[PDB]
């Protein structure tokens, strides 16, 4: 009867959750979008009126547009899509879960294929994050008995969840950092523009509104691609950790709390 | 140095699979790729001629319709963001890290707002996961009891892995063929496209391309919305589950495999 309390809190938890965010959210964005549609209403008025178009003309002409960009096409000179370095840019977002959809499947063949390569993929991407976890938990253990052994001259080391969620969290923080210095010059973004989009792409939600190495020519572009991909494939291990301990952490303390109501 | 052995060798094995995939992709891709550039090529062609406009000012005016699209505007009427239900959709698709991408938020405020919102909410959401998986072979378990004692008449009952994992994909493959019994009117998309965006959102990849439940009128609209959530959270579900227990048996046939190779 326990383990049915703690389901049933944490679903309640989770829904009052969603409650709050959505309502905060709204608050936050809805005078931003009505003043973005209102911005852009005005400018398509301004525009038909300009050259005495219709707006029949323009809505098809918007319709064709909104196919090509679905097919690659943009207004500012990006990369080719499923090319070799783009299919693996893609291959790379499908098995980590991110899904940018900055490129997406558009025949039937290349979507039977996805389905079949996510299905195999997927598995391996989570176990390789989970030896990375456990490999990493024993260099710390190895390294605090080691450091205590050599500081004596004056296995059971495993360290407290607690230790290795602050471990985690530095580490994040370290690569965010670093990405965000390197994306800021290079892109035409802000830092914490930067921040976001590393924030967003290592937790793989992957909105997409924000993609890197998107811009066809990127000067060296050999480097540059190999460092972004690094980066990402750094700041993903280390989030999926942080994610785990702190599932762990909440774990702990939902029993507590139901230890404590009686 | 065994657990080192089967972390570089998952290594290795993820990295050929990454170049095959993309490979792959490619081959199937490029070709309609670039037939697509090059339809869009002609009808911006054919557009520009007819009305006399510059491509200057075709640029400039498609420029607008990004920036305006970037706010969620579409060619075709589409449901408001951020009033108080596309908030519920949008936390909805962040606390699950599926992340559909087609509400992002876009002032200051909003973006601080969903670090701290998705760093304390996914790790609840893949708590909830693991409670159900851990409930759902408690109640196997005891299904399988309860059958070998009635069929007698004439705890360490738990499955092993490979039934979880059949029953699971049976579970998976009948939640994506209920739920495409609608989706499929409704949306007026074709089955297969049902079934492969519901493949695509229950593994939490969330491309965007196909997003469903935004169509401004949806006729009922009231029991829509709640369908769609139900449908959603239990593919979800399914295939999380499906994952991990995948992911296990992969790591069982590492192990194998290096015991082969002695
Ligand atoms: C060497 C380690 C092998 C393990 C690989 C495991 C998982 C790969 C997961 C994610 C990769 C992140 C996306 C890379 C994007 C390529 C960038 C570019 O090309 O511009
Ligand atoms: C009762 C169970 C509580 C636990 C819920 C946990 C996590 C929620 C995760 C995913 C739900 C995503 C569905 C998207 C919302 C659709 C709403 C709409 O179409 O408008
Ligand atoms: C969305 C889930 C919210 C998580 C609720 C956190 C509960 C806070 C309890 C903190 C005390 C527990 C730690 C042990 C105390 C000795
Ligand atoms: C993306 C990497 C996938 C690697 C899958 C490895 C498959 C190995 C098959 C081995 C089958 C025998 C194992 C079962 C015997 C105990
Ligand atoms: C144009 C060069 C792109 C470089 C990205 C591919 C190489 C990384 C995969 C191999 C890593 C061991
Ligand atoms: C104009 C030169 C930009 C090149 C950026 C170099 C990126 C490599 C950093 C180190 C890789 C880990
Ligand atoms: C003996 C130790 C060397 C092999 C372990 C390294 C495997 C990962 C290297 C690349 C970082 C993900
Ligand atoms: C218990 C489920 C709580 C969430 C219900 C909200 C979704 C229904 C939307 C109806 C709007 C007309
Ligand atoms: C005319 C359109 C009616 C569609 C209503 C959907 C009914 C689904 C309810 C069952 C939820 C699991
Ligand atoms: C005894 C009842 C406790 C459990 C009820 C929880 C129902 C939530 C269903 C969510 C399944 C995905
Ligand atoms: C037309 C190519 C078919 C690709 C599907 C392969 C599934 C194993
Ligand atoms: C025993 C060596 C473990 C490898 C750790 C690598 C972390 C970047
Ligand atoms: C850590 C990488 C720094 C890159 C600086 C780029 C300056 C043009
Ligand atoms: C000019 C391309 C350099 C690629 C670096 C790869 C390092 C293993
Ligand atoms: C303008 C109000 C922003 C509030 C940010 C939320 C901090 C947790
Ligand atoms: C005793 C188990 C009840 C909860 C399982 C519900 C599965 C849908
Ligand atoms: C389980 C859903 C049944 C099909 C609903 C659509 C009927 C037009
Ligand atoms: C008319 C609104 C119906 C809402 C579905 C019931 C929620 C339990
Ligand atoms: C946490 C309380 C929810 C508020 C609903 C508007
Ligand atoms: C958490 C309650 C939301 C307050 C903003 C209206
Ligand atoms: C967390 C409270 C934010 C209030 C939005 C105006
Ligand atoms: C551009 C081809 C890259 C080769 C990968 C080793
Ligand atoms: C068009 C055939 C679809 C096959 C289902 C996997
Ligand atoms: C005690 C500090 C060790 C950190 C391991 C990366
Ligand atoms: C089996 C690896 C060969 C490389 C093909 C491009
Ligand atoms: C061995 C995987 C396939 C290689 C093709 C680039
Ligand atoms: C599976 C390897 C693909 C080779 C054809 C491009
Ligand atoms: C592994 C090689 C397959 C070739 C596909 C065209
Ligand atoms: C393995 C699939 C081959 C693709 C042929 C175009
Ligand atoms: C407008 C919908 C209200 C939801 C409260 C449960
Ligand atoms: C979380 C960093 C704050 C950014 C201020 C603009
Ligand atoms: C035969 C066991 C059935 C379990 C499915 C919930
Ligand atoms: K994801
Ligand atoms: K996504
Ligand atoms: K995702
Ligand atoms: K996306």
């Known amino acids: 009867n326990e383990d049915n309390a703690r389901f049933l809190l944490l679903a309640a938890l989770i829904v009052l959750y969603l409650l709050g965010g959505a309502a905060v959210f709204s608050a936050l964005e809805l005078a931003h979008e009505r003043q973005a549609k209102q911005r852009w209403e005005e400018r398509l008025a301004q525009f038909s009126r300009g050259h005495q178009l219709s707006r029949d003309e323009l809505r098809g002409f918007l319709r064709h547009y909104e ?20 299919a693996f840019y893609f291959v790379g977002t499908v098995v980590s879960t991110i899904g940018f ?9 290349g979507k039977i294929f996805l389905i079949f390569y ?4 997927c598995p391996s991407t989570i176990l390789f994050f989970n030896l990375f976890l456990e490999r990493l938990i ?9 450091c205590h052994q050599r500081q004596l001259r004056r296995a059971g080391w495993k360290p407290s969840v607690y230790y290795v969620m602050l471990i985690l969290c530095t580490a994040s923080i370290l690569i965010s ?13 802000s830092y914490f523009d930067s921040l976001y989009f590393c924030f967003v792409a290592f937790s793989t939600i992957g909105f997409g509104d924000l993609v890197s190495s998107q811009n066809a020519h990127y000067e060296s572009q050999g480097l540059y691609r190999f460092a972004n991909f690094v980066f990402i494939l750094m700041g993903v291990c280390c989030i999926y ?3 785990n301990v702190i599932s762990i952490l909440i774990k702990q303390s939902l029993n507590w709390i139901l230890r404590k109501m009686d």
Not at 67 to 80: C, S
Not at 118 to 121: I, S, W
Not at 138 to 146: L, N
Not at 177 to 187: F, G, H, L, Q
Request: aromatic share 10%; hydrophobic share 40%.
């Open 241 to 243: 950790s942080l994610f």
């Open 67 to 86: 196919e090509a960009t679905r097919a690659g096409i943009r207004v500012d000179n990006v990369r080719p899509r499923w090319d070799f370095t783009g």
């Open 118 to 121: 996510g299905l195999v993929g």
């Open 101 to 109: 959809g900055m490129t997406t499947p558009a025949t039937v063949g």
């Open 177 to 189: 950092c670093c990405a965000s210095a390197m994306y800021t010059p290079i892109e035409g973004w």
């Open 138 to 146: 024993t260099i710390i253990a190895y390294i605090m008995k080691s």
